[PDB]
Amino acid sequence: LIASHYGVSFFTIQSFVSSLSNTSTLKNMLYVLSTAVEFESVPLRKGDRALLVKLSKRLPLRFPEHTSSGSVSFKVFLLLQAYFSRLELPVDFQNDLKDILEKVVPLINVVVDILSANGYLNATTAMDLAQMLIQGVWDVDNPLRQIPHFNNKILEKCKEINVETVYDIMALEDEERDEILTLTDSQLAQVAAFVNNYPNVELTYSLNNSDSGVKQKITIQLTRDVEPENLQVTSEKYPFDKLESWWLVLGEVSKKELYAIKKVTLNKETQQYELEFDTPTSGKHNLTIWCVCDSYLDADKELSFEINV
């Protein structure tokens, strides 16, 4: 499907800015996201609150206690968690969840932008949430769970053999693979679609080596084993079409400062980009570069290095 276009309202940007901070957690961000005025187009029916209160007993993150649960925010916060946890929902909530998911992508990117434009490194946590919204799983979930039809049985027979990542599955011989993949050809088709476009990239970079109040430009390159036929994303749970994108981030963990960020698409077997940042406070800094995908979990890459001021 195609998600109806829209630009997050300035009113929502103001609200997000006002609510987010350098210490916001994954939970805080989910709550903030749930407050977007944009969600007021989502139905709130008589009887829904009572159903949602029950549902909340089965979900990990609590809605802000002293906040009214008679808002659509309560519904959005909880159904999104039900989505990540893959809980069964009655049809009306299923319909509502779909309406909610149609609007989340623009909103989570605004969260990422706000935190990053402020140089807050927790921008990476917003990115984790972004991935969760696309695959319908938690960041702490078994990474294989995002593969279509990978039920608990299969996951268990991946554990015994020590198969942990999508790459491991493919590194497998062919009847160790079949033992793992006990599914119908129809199901295997959707498994295939997923593995076919699941990314595997390699990250590298370069400098100029010497400085200070002025801008240093680092050069980051991303390598794929093959230019992907395309970047259409495969998601069993996200009902709309999505194009694969990545954030290139340079930061300093110790200070949890985000030097600079850049959104790119890795549509080639090899790419190169350049980020300009300011040149830090003397002494030296232990810096890291993250290449984070916005559409899959467990495919990110990073590498750290030392500037000697």
- For 233, the token pair is 């994303």
Write down the H helix ranges in 65-181. 72-84, 91-117, 123-135, 152-159, 166-171, 177-180
- 3-state secondary structure (DSSP) of residue 178: helix
Q: Which helix H or strand E contains 301, and what residues bound it?
A: strand 301-307
Q: Which residues, including other chains, have CB under 8 Å from residue 108's CB and lie 6 or more apart?
A: 33, 126, 129, 130, 133
- 3-state secondary structure (DSSP) of residue 54: helix
- For 160, the token pair is 């015994």
Query: What CA–CA distance (Å, rounded) separates 39 from 35?
Result: 8
Query: What CA–CA distance (Å, rounded) separates 117 from 35?
Result: 21
| DSSP annotation of 58 | T
β-partners of residue 270 are: 223
Query: What CA–CA distance (Å, rounded) separates 233 from 82?
Result: 22
Side-chain-side CA neighbours of residue 232 (13 Å) = 10
**Cβ atoms of 61 and 81 closer than 8 Å:** yes
Strand order in the sheet with 201-206: 201-206, 216-224, 270-277
**Cβ atoms of 167 and 202 closer than 8 Å:** no
Query: What CA–CA distance (Å, rounded) separates 176 from 161?
Result: 9
In this structure, the strands spanning 270-277 and 285-293 are unpaired
Side-chain-side CA neighbours of residue 9 (13 Å) = 10
CA angle (147 as vertex; 171, 174 as ends), nearest 5: 30
Domain ranges of the chain: 1-118, 119-309
**Cβ atoms of 64 and 56 closer than 8 Å:** no
Q: Which helix H or strand E contains 18, and what residues bound it?
A: helix 10-19
**Cβ atoms of 200 and 185 closer than 8 Å:** no
User: Looking at domain 1-118, what is its CATH homologous superfamily?
Assistant: Sec63 N-terminal domain-like domain (1.10.3380.10)
Number of residues written out for the chain: 309
Exposure string of 175-184, with b = 16+ CB inside 10 Å and e = fewer, is eeeeebbebe
**Cβ atoms of 82 and 101 closer than 8 Å:** no
Q: What is the resolution of this structure in A?
A: 2.0
Query: What CA–CA distance (Å, rounded) separates 97 from 75?
Result: 9
Query: What CA–CA distance (Å, rounded) separates 102 from 239?
Result: 8
Q: Which residues, including other chains, have CB under 8 Å from residue 161's CB and lie 6 or more apart?
A: 176, 180
* Among 59, 91, 72, CA closest to 33: 72
- For 280, the token pair is 């830090």
How many helices (H) and strands (E) in the chain? 10, 7
Query: What CA–CA distance (Å, rounded) separates 282 from 308?
Result: 8
